[PDB]
Amino acid sequence: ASPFRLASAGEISEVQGILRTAGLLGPEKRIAYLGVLDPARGAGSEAEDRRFRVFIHDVSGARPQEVTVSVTNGTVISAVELDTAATGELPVLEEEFEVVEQLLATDERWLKALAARNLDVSKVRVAPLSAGVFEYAEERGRRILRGLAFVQDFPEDSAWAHPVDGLVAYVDVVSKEVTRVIDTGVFPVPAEHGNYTDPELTGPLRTTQKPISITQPEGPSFTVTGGNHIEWEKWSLDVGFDVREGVVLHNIAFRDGDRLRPIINRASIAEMVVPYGDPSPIRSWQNYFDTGEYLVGQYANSLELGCDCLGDITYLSPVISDAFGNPREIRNGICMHEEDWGILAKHSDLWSGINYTRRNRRMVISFFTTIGNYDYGFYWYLYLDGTIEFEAKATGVVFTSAFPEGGSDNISQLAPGLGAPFHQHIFSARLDMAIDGFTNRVEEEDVVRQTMGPGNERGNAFSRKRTVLTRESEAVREADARTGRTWIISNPESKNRLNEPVGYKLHAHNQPTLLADPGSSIARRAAFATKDLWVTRYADDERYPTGDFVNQHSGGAGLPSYIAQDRDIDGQDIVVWHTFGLTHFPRVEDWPIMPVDTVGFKLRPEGFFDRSPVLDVPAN
Amino acid sequence: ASPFRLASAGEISEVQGILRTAGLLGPEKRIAYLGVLDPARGAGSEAEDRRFRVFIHDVSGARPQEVTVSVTNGTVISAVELDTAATGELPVLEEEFEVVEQLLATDERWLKALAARNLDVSKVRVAPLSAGVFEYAEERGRRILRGLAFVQDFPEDSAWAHPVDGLVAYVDVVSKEVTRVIDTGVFPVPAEHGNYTDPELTGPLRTTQKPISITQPEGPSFTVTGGNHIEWEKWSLDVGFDVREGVVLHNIAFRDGDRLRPIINRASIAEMVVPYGDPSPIRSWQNYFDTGEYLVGQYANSLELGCDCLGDITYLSPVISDAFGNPREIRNGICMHEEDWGILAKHSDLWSGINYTRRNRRMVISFFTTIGNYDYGFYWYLYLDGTIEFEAKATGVVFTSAFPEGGSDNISQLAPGLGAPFHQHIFSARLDMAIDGFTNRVEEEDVVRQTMGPGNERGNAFSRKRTVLTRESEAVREADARTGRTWIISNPESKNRLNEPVGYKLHAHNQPTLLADPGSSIARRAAFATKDLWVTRYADDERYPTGDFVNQHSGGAGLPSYIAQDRDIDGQDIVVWHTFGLTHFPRVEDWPIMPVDTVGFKLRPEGFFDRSPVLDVPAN
Ligand SMILES: [Cu+2]
Ligand SMILES: [Cu+2]
Ligand code: NA
Ligand code: NA
């Protein structure tokens, strides 16, 4: 069996047993993260050894532990106690979400704040939000969540339409104490509902949409073997799933004639941060690390046939661990299908008389996650012509506030009295490259303009330049859309038939990066998001751009510390980290439920093949 | 009934009869352009007066004429004799292209150049290309084409694989004279063939692609009335066709409740320039104005069901004039269909228990044109959520040269001895805006970064600023991807329910603009291409960014001359001109036939609606 196969329910049950017998999984213990470890570097790695990494939380207040288990041999490999004031707290537990609202419901200060606003405590929902690191010295070493309140007029009401501004509370979820309740003043609670299924708001549903039927009468063109190995139109890869990162792609390769040629060893979205740009003290701390703090894989949706995924769909149902080590299946959590993608190539030639048209198609691997008010779709696309593309789709309900009388420079008005603070959604793609093998390098390619004069007498010439990034200290790069800047990952030891190194070109969308002040807490904790491109030398413990323990970590972990080793990256085993994001000034059309907006990146072959790789596509 | 209906064969025959009766279309005359004029401003106006504009060429060398005729009344409205050395030559005629190869085949200088290369003149194809304006004083006032040679080994051979470098000739196509033959030296003719249907090159065709079937059992959701009026999912528009511009969209409007709200009065691609960046004297003059010089609508393909357009397709077959005034139908030249477009909106709410998913779709209007080696697809998209998007798809065969022995800074190597010069493909979209009516203004929106300090103590705030463009002299704008720059077209006299002006936001791709030296001939003739955004006050005669007569015209017309009027554009009838393009450094994978690459722009509502406009979309 493949070492890259999905974790099975049986594997997770064995991890639980091993931890139990070792004395590491008592009634006070909770599993905050569990995932399978990738095989170590080894082109001849023979014996099967499936190992799992576990973060163990203690609800009584004892120190948490990081444990590595071998399910193959049934042993604990290492177990380290963690000093969370130094290295960061563990990810937020699903069961800690409920605790915030219930603790506040009995706090005298919370109740007095609600009574001043004539709000029934039974109708006040509390969003439990990650705390970050700011000025409160008493929070160092404690698990803190912060809570913001929303009113639910009835059980099916959309609470996001009724933010309770001017009020925030901080809670220690281990000792179960409310540390602070801050009331900065009374704002009216917006009264309009935002119930997008209420006929009063939708009006009569349209009757004009006729069905679109997409079928594959002979079944799909791809095959799935060993549970998660995909072969499709010369592509070969393994579809993994991790509770923190979500869908992970392994061993992406392309069959060029008789040879299977590697392209990407591992592709994932290794972090995503949602920083808010409202300076009100009610929200100026608000930054979601959806991947690092919340774990986007554990909130993956079950995707419905004909609604979420349309066509001839093949599903995967990944298995994760719950907080006690029991396996939990995410039924239909991953959709896979191919779809038509228009014209691939076309030419009508006057001189030869030949008319030629071929159609394109793409393989789609997707999942959707829901973190509170937000819903995100993650889509990986493989195209016939060798292009690889990632797309994030952002939808859900925007996070709301009051709209202040007299307006705001940092908040959009969506409805009478209802605001939506400005924010960004910034992703980090971790691309462990393997262009024809592991000896790779990155070049930055800029367009070069030339001045009219000798050798360019008509002033028409233009050119390009490539700069090799040779060391990590010079491999932190910024976009430059005006000069057409792209980055090429090549293998200097593998040449095409023209004797040039084979390569792939990364095309970014060139959206703005992190806008916060460079001195801010979020700029230190999300340093990856301040630059478009980072290149590191591969190391097996350098997994996330924000470090292993993001929750309440003081800053600098991850990419800034990796880069500081200043390692050789010129013709080496390297990892590309690409930052890309959406800057969201909410519009009235985003309310009461937001239409999808998108961002992504793509990689295209650049002299990887000896000619077009789609000459053998049939005419249809 | 509709004044925006497509021209009919009868109208074109009637124009021919009117011109003949008036003495303007004798046997020495040729129609170089014929198109219907849009109604003048005034909702109602002329009851029905269909007017046509005609450019009449004279093959005996007499001066050409611009003529306006009323087909309704059977009259010539105006006829002006043109001074082409001043205002520009007429577009190239299809019959002039054939002249070039035939004239050169009997020229002693051409024959000696081919004899020096051991080439058989019967196998040498000549690409006839527009001449531009350079240093040759004898070309002023004459219709010139320039020829580059390619060898065709046999009648079905792709001649583009065999460029004859070092050789170019200039031809007067009216007096039938070869003016100059320039031979800068013998280059080897690349010998490899580029025949992408030859099994020796394709290999065995794939048997792995299973069919994808897209059908609409109840027919499409849009209706077509009056030949070219579309209603689809609250959108309303008319699809026009012009032999110069191709597909033109008129009267784009959205039905919001019981109000039909205008958005765009007229949308077209009003110019497209393809400048080459090779400083060799054999090619340094090479710039295609596909729209203005060649007329892209004239070369539209007939699109094949199931190959070019897949699904439940509705076709339009526009009628154009040939060079004698006879109607010519372009059968199946426009495809229209709706497409599934994934998730529209999605949210699973923990507090209400409601799970909500809706799917998106788009309406597609497309045509394809072939100009020599290149093929371009023009796609207009309408989405459920009010988004409008344009996409250009570039494919075909790249233009080739020899690859010099010691390499090149301006040419890519594609195959042994075979080069492809660097070039760009740059488009100008002309958007005659009508956001809720004709009183519009444009604002430039930049993100604003804020420094940590008083009122921003945690350094997290960020904002935006909008700058109104009030006069034409300040409305020539550049992109700035780093600051997230976009442009908003709003109506200051039409407010949404929050008392804010309704608007649409233009999102650019922020690709490089024209790279040539600003002193060059092409920078003067294609001045529009040097900036991303221009805004003018509407005027009936300001139709193209390059002026009416582009062929062999120096600078002095087009957008720089319009802008000098410095007209008020703050709440007025305005036109937005957006430049966007691809910079093409050809790759090996582009050879021997290029996979599609794309570029475009989109417009999204920005407080145009009072809430999401897709709340009434059904589940299905
Ligand atoms: Cu957002
Ligand atoms: Cu090109
Ligand atoms: Na690597
Ligand atoms: Na206008």
Side-chain angles (χ1 to χ4, degrees):
Chain A
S2 163
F4 297 94
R5 64 190 185 270
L6 296 167
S8 60
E11 273 181 317
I12 289 175
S13 285
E14 281 293 307
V15 167
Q16 184 191 52
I18 294 161
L19 295 174
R20 265 176 186 173
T21 69
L24 304 170
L25 204 60
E28 64 297 8
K29 303 302 190 194
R30 304 287 186 274
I31 294 175
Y33 168 83
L34 178 147
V36 68
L37 290 167
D38 290 352
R41 285 301 201 255
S45 297
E46 179 75 62
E48 166 178 28
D49 194 7
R50 293 275 284 189
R51 321 181 154 207
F52 284 73
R53 189 186 192 199
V54 190
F55 299 165
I56 300 178
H57 173 65
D58 183 289
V59 299
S60 71
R63 280 145 94 84
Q65 298 172 81
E66 172 181 351
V67 185
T68 299
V69 175
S70 166
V71 313
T72 307
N73 304 319
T75 56
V76 173
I77 293 184
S78 57
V80 184
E81 265 190 353
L82 300 172
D83 185 334
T84 62
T87 50
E89 302 291 333
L90 277 52
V92 181
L93 287 171
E94 181 169 20
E95 75 186 52
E96 293 168 320
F97 292 158
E98 291 229 292
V99 179
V100 180
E101 186 177 312
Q102 260 78 233
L103 281 180
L104 290 171
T106 57
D107 185 87
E108 262 142 39
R109 320 159 258 185
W110 187 254
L111 295 170
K112 307 327 158 209
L114 292 188
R117 301 162 164 85
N118 304 308
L119 301 175
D120 182 346
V121 63
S122 72
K123 292 167 152 215
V124 175
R125 302 290 76 83
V126 179
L129 303 189
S130 57
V133 183
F134 295 95
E135 311 88 2
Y136 309 109
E138 82 269 12
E139 304 186 343
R140 305 151 166 184
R142 285 149 126 261
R143 277 178 81 79
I144 302 295
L145 292 172
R146 310 195 198 276
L148 294 169
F150 298 85
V151 180
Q152 223 189 347
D153 285 339
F154 52 91
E156 298 80 32
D157 192 39
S158 182
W160 316 101
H162 317 295
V164 185
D165 211 327
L167 179 61
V168 64
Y170 314 156
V171 183
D172 177 331
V173 298
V174 176
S175 74
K176 292 178 177 162
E177 301 172 302
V178 182
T179 60
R180 289 169 201 256
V181 180
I182 290 168
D183 192 336
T184 61
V186 169
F187 297 71
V189 175
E192 284 196 3
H193 74 74
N195 294 324
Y196 34 85
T197 64
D198 183 338
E200 149 192 28
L201 186 57
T202 68
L205 301 183
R206 326 179 166 191
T207 62
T208 51
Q209 294 197 351
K210 304 295 182 48
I212 302 174
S213 173
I214 301 171
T215 57
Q216 295 206 83
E218 297 173 40
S221 309
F222 57 88
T223 62
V224 183
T225 55
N228 72 332
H229 180 79
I230 305 307
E231 305 264 347
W232 175 82
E233 295 300 299
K234 312 253 183 124
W235 293 98
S236 170
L237 69 155
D238 304 297
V239 181
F241 191 85
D242 177 80
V243 69
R244 176 168 178 164
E245 288 174 292
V247 163
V248 174
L249 303 183
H250 299 274
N251 304 309
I252 302 173
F254 195 103
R255 183 158 267 103
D256 185 9
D258 299 325
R259 184 158 62 118
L260 185 57
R261 299 176 68 191
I263 294 161
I264 293 175
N265 183 63
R266 201 188 182 275
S268 68
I269 305 301
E271 187 56 86
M272 61 162 296
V273 62
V274 189
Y276 277 76
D278 175 6
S280 164
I282 305 310
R283 286 171 298 279
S284 58
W285 49 267
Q286 176 173 206
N287 303 277
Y288 305 76
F289 292 77
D290 290 332
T291 305
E293 288 166 338
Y294 290 90
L295 313 186
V296 304
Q298 87 178 310
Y299 299 109
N301 303 177
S302 291
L303 304 173
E304 292 271 40
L305 191 53
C307 303
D308 299 295
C309 303
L310 183 74
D312 194 311
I313 307 302
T314 294
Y315 290 99
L316 302 180
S317 301
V319 175
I320 65 179
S321 174
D322 69 18
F324 303 97
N326 310 286
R328 173 161 89 81
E329 188 186 45
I330 304 174
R331 179 165 136 83
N332 296 345
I334 303 172
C335 286
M336 303 189 296
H337 68 280
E338 53 176 347
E339 53 190 27
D340 178 85
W341 200 247
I343 297 302
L344 171 61
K346 178 173 169 64
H347 179 55
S348 307
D349 195 76
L350 177 57
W351 292 328
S352 73
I354 296 173
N355 300 321
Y356 178 95
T357 307
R358 297 293 188 269
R359 283 196 81 85
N360 203 1
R361 44 173 81 182
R362 65 182 187 182
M363 174 90 194
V364 181
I365 300 156
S366 67
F367 81 106
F368 250 91
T369 191
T370 301
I371 310 282
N373 52 299
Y374 274 141
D375 307 64
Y376 302 101
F378 296 70
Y379 294 74
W380 293 91
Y381 308 123
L382 309 165
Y383 296 86
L384 291 180
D385 65 1
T387 297
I388 309 158
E389 189 183 350
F390 173 81
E391 178 164 54
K393 303 195 175 177
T395 180
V397 178
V398 295
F399 199 92
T400 55
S401 65
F403 192 70
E405 219 184 350
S408 171
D409 298 322
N410 305 283
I411 303 174
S412 296
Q413 193 178 19
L414 302 183
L418 182 69
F422 299 168
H423 59 279
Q424 308 179 269
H425 303 267
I426 299 180
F427 302 80
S428 181
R430 188 187 171 273
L431 305 174
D432 170 12
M433 298 303 302
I435 302 294
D436 251 355
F438 282 113
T439 307
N440 297 163
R441 72 185 185 190
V442 180
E443 293 167 287
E444 177 167 286
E445 181 182 279
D446 290 344
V447 175
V448 170
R449 309 185 39 163
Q450 299 178 238
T451 58
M452 186 160 177
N456 181 34
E457 290 75 14
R458 288 184 171 143
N460 66 301
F462 64 90
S463 185
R464 56 172 170 192
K465 65 165 185 174
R466 290 179 182 176
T467 303
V468 177
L469 313 183
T470 67
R471 302 241 141 209
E472 290 179 308
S473 56
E474 69 195 16
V476 190
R477 314 309 288 189
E478 301 184 338
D480 188 336
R482 191 171 324 282
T483 72
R485 173 170 298 168
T486 60
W487 297 273
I488 301 160
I489 306 97
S490 63
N491 181 334
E493 286 171 24
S494 183
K495 316 288 197 75
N496 59 34
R497 75 179 184 119
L498 303 183
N499 203 36
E500 299 174 12
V502 299
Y504 257 74
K505 179 178 275 184
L506 169 68
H507 292 267
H509 289 194
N510 300 319
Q511 302 292 313
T513 49
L514 188 74
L515 296 171
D517 185 283
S520 64
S521 175
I522 186 59
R524 292 179 22 92
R525 295 179 65 232
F528 76 93
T530 63
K531 302 283 175 174
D532 302 80
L533 193 94
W534 310 66
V535 185
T536 60
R537 175 93 165 246
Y538 170 83
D540 47 43
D541 63 332
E542 300 180 1
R543 296 176 173 102
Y544 314 106
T546 43
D548 289 326
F549 309 101
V550 176
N551 188 14
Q552 296 181 254
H553 187 277
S554 56
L559 272 174
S561 75
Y562 309 158
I563 283 298
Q565 300 169 92
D566 196 24
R567 294 164 295 186
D568 181 9
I569 55 167
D570 180 9
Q572 302 285 355
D573 191 351
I574 58 172
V575 183
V576 172
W577 314 69
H578 173 49
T579 295
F580 59 101
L582 287 170
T583 295
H584 191 182
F585 304 105
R587 67 203 174 125
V588 180
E589 292 89 352
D590 293 334
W591 183 255
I593 182 163
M594 178 206 321
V596 156
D597 201 5
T598 60
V599 67
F601 64 89
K602 70 185 178 192
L603 292 107
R604 305 174 89 221
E606 173 70 40
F608 189 83
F609 300 103
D610 288 340
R611 59 189 57 82
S612 169
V614 288
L615 298 180
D616 62 344
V617 169
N620 161 35
Chain B
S2 165
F4 297 97
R5 66 191 182 267
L6 296 167
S8 65
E11 282 180 309
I12 292 173
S13 292
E14 200 63 28
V15 172
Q16 178 195 62
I18 295 164
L19 298 173
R20 289 189 167 158
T21 296
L24 299 170
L25 197 66
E28 73 282 26
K29 303 303 189 183
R30 302 290 187 272
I31 292 179
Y33 166 87
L34 180 150
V36 69
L37 294 169
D38 291 351
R41 288 299 208 255
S45 293
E46 268 272 22
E48 204 219 330
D49 186 16
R50 292 274 284 191
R51 293 168 169 211
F52 286 74
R53 186 147 88 128
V54 192
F55 299 167
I56 303 179
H57 171 60
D58 186 301
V59 301
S60 71
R63 305 229 276 202
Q65 309 193 37
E66 168 181 358
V67 180
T68 290
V69 309
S70 169
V71 67
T72 313
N73 297 321
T75 59
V76 172
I77 291 168
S78 63
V80 305
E81 188 174 279
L82 300 168
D83 190 330
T84 64
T87 49
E89 303 289 336
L90 296 196
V92 184
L93 292 177
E94 198 175 1
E95 70 194 64
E96 284 168 334
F97 289 133
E98 333 173 355
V99 167
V100 173
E101 184 174 315
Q102 307 181 236
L103 276 180
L104 289 170
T106 63
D107 183 272
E108 164 177 57
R109 299 160 288 182
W110 188 253
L111 291 176
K112 299 298 146 17
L114 307 181
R117 293 153 166 92
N118 307 128
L119 300 173
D120 178 5
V121 63
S122 73
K123 297 189 164 192
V124 173
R125 301 288 83 75
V126 177
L129 310 170
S130 64
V133 179
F134 290 95
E135 314 81 7
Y136 310 110
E138 80 274 8
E139 304 184 341
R140 297 152 181 185
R142 293 169 75 179
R143 287 178 69 77
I144 301 286
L145 293 176
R146 312 195 195 281
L148 296 170
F150 297 86
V151 177
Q152 220 188 352
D153 287 335
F154 55 90
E156 299 82 14
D157 193 38
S158 185
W160 313 104
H162 305 124
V164 183
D165 213 326
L167 179 63
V168 59
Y170 311 156
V171 173
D172 182 326
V173 293
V174 173
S175 66
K176 312 256 186 302
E177 266 160 7
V178 176
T179 56
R180 296 181 193 244
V181 176
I182 294 171
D183 188 340
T184 59
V186 169
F187 292 78
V189 174
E192 236 174 59
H193 73 73
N195 292 324
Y196 36 84
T197 67
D198 182 343
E200 318 220 65
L201 185 56
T202 66
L205 298 189
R206 304 179 190 198
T207 59
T208 52
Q209 297 202 348
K210 300 294 212 302
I212 300 162
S213 173
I214 300 173
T215 62
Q216 294 199 268
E218 304 179 20
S221 311
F222 57 89
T223 63
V224 182
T225 56
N228 70 331
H229 180 79
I230 308 304
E231 304 264 339
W232 175 80
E233 294 300 297
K234 308 214 169 162
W235 293 97
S236 177
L237 67 154
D238 309 291
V239 182
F241 190 85
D242 176 79
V243 68
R244 179 166 176 168
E245 286 176 293
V247 164
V248 175
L249 302 188
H250 292 102
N251 302 310
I252 302 177
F254 196 102
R255 191 176 287 300
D256 184 11
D258 51 10
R259 318 180 284 128
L260 184 60
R261 299 175 66 192
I263 298 168
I264 292 173
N265 183 249
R266 195 188 191 272
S268 66
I269 301 305
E271 188 56 85
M272 64 169 290
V273 61
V274 181
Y276 277 76
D278 174 7
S280 164
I282 302 306
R283 282 172 299 279
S284 59
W285 49 269
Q286 196 179 179
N287 306 276
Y288 301 70
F289 288 81
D290 298 293
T291 301
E293 282 168 345
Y294 292 88
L295 313 180
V296 299
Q298 179 171 25
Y299 300 109
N301 310 164
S302 293
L303 303 169
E304 211 191 330
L305 186 66
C307 238
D308 299 295
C309 303
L310 182 72
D312 197 313
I313 307 300
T314 295
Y315 286 102
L316 301 180
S317 295
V319 183
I320 67 178
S321 178
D322 69 14
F324 298 94
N326 309 115
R328 169 189 149 190
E329 185 182 58
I330 299 174
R331 182 136 228 166
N332 298 166
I334 302 172
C335 288
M336 305 188 297
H337 66 286
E338 54 176 346
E339 283 183 347
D340 175 84
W341 200 247
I343 300 307
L344 166 67
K346 183 168 166 69
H347 180 56
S348 312
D349 197 71
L350 176 62
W351 291 328
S352 71
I354 296 175
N355 302 320
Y356 175 97
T357 309
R358 296 294 186 266
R359 280 197 84 83
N360 205 358
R361 37 174 89 185
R362 62 182 192 180
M363 170 92 184
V364 183
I365 301 151
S366 63
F367 82 105
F368 256 90
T369 193
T370 299
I371 291 182
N373 52 302
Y374 272 123
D375 306 65
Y376 302 104
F378 293 74
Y379 293 76
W380 293 92
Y381 305 126
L382 303 187
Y383 296 85
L384 297 178
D385 72 345
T387 299
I388 303 159
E389 167 173 25
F390 173 82
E391 175 166 55
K393 302 193 181 188
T395 176
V397 180
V398 301
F399 201 91
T400 53
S401 63
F403 190 71
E405 187 144 359
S408 174
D409 294 325
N410 309 102
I411 300 167
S412 296
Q413 190 176 19
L414 304 177
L418 181 70
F422 299 169
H423 56 280
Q424 310 182 269
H425 304 265
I426 304 172
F427 304 80
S428 173
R430 174 186 182 278
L431 308 171
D432 178 5
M433 301 300 305
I435 301 297
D436 248 357
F438 283 116
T439 297
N440 299 343
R441 76 183 177 195
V442 175
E443 299 172 274
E444 184 168 278
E445 176 179 284
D446 285 346
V447 313
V448 170
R449 299 189 64 179
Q450 298 181 240
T451 65
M452 184 163 51
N456 182 27
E457 293 83 353
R458 292 181 170 146
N460 68 296
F462 65 87
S463 186
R464 57 174 166 188
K465 60 167 179 187
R466 291 179 179 176
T467 303
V468 184
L469 312 188
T470 62
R471 300 200 81 82
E472 287 180 306
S473 58
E474 65 192 37
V476 190
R477 315 303 296 192
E478 304 192 321
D480 186 348
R482 285 183 170 81
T483 72
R485 177 171 292 168
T486 62
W487 298 272
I488 296 167
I489 306 92
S490 60
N491 187 325
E493 316 217 296
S494 183
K495 278 127 172 299
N496 62 33
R497 75 179 187 115
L498 304 177
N499 207 21
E500 292 171 0
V502 297
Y504 257 74
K505 176 175 293 183
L506 159 68
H507 293 266
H509 288 192
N510 299 322
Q511 297 294 313
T513 50
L514 189 72
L515 299 172
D517 185 286
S520 62
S521 173
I522 186 59
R524 283 180 292 143
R525 298 179 62 230
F528 74 91
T530 63
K531 308 275 158 164
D532 301 81
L533 197 93
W534 310 65
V535 185
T536 61
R537 178 74 166 267
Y538 171 83
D540 299 314
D541 58 336
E542 295 179 9
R543 295 181 172 95
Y544 314 107
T546 43
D548 285 332
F549 309 103
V550 181
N551 187 19
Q552 298 177 250
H553 184 47
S554 63
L559 275 170
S561 72
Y562 307 155
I563 287 299
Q565 299 167 279
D566 199 23
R567 291 162 299 189
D568 173 18
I569 54 169
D570 183 8
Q572 303 288 170
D573 193 348
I574 60 173
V575 184
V576 172
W577 312 72
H578 174 49
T579 297
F580 59 103
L582 286 173
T583 298
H584 191 179
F585 304 102
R587 50 187 193 148
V588 176
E589 290 90 351
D590 292 332
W591 187 254
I593 182 160
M594 176 188 158
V596 156
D597 203 4
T598 59
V599 71
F601 66 89
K602 70 168 77 161
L603 292 115
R604 297 178 94 220
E606 172 65 42
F608 190 84
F609 299 103
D610 285 344
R611 56 184 60 78
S612 168
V614 286
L615 297 183
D616 64 341
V617 171
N620 72 320

